[model samples]
Target: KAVSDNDDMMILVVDDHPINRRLLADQLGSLGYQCKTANDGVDALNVLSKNHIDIVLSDVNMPNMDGYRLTQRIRQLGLTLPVIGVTANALAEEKQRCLESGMDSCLSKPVTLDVIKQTLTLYAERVRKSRDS
Candidate 1:
């Protein structure tokens, strides 16, 4: 069956920092969700092709492919799944850049369970509406 809700959905975690990926993935499980990890955007795309990723939480800075380029490429690939940009900078302009790059929303670094839950809750509503149509 097609995964239709946030609980069953899978998140693709893209970050150059291994610690960051592990920490977030662990936290996701705490919230009863599954996730996949990628070192950078290149790896992320490869994972994307091989798995069903419901949402993308990608770090903004990386060596091979940054979040901006990744999101742009994801759009080019015709995938409309929500992409949430994660950056240490967390500037207003950085968030704007994320939107311009096609991210559904942008989150600051040091992401907590509560922040992630809130963000997912906010966007899951949109997903439900579109799926119902």
Candidate 2:
């Protein structure tokens, strides 16, 4: 999916899988998002600390730290960053857990370009509105 005034939006994608990160970056970048990628939660936290990230699309499982803990740190840091979890777990309980962990939303694995586009714009716009207001 495409975004309006795309150049101004920066997205941080966190996944331990190299291909997944590249694919996400390529797909989102084609639609004009400025994409940043991190391997795991620790790396993602480092990336966040050093840059202006508008939103985060991340995998649930990773080494060193996971997405849930990542969100905890993000929240604790008072960043007001919007995080969307992309996980292999698609059960109702899993989704609920993600929410409880401070994710704005969660998506099932094998996530499609369309789904990715939808959530990316969803949280991105949400954060945008709050920032604007």
Candidate 3:
């Protein structure tokens, strides 16, 4: 079956690792989503300030600023864009902390194509419903 295409979907991926960033970009690209990458939270914030991103996929551990702090900053800035925490550690408490820190969802790292597809599908559907309402 063909995947649904949403050309206007813009995703921001934040991770300190270049390999991880490339992997995410490749996955999103295959799904026809425009994706931007950031090496750290500072870069992520800068990108956010300049782009109309639909969602944020961020790593929890990084130099300078972590995902928690980034989520906090985004919330403080009053931007309601969906931010999803992406981490290697998938502990329940970690996920809870991410949500409490302002992340809309949490996903484990080494993400599979299915995981990305499902997350984006849910977020896109939510956006569509919200627009309709």
Better of 1 and 3 by lDDT: 3
Regions of model 1 farther than 4 Å from truth: 1-7, 63-65, 90-100
> Which 10-residue window of candidate 2 scores lowest in summed lDDT?
89-98
Runs in model 3 deviating more than 4 A are 1-6, 63-65, 90-100
Runs off by more than 4 Å, candidate 2: 1-6, 62-65, 90-100
Q: Mind giving the per-residue lDDT tens digits that candidate 1 earns over 1-133?
A: 6966655667787776788888887777776767787777656666888887777787654423365666667666766677677866534536444554756666665778887787766666766675577
Ranking by TM-score: 3, 2, 1
What TM-score would each prediction reach against the true structure? 0.77, 0.77, 0.79
TM-score of 3: 0.79
Over 24-131, each residue of candidate 2 has an lDDT whose tens digit, in order, gives: 777887767888888776566678889888887776544233655666666666657776666654344254435546566666546567877777677677888879
Candidate 1: residue 34 Cα off by (Å): 1.3
Q: Pick the candidate with the highest lDDT.
A: 3
Tell me the lDDT of model 1 at 11.
75
| Residue-wise C-alpha lDDT for candidate 3, range 48-101, written one tens digit per residue | 888778888876444233655666677776666677777664345364445547
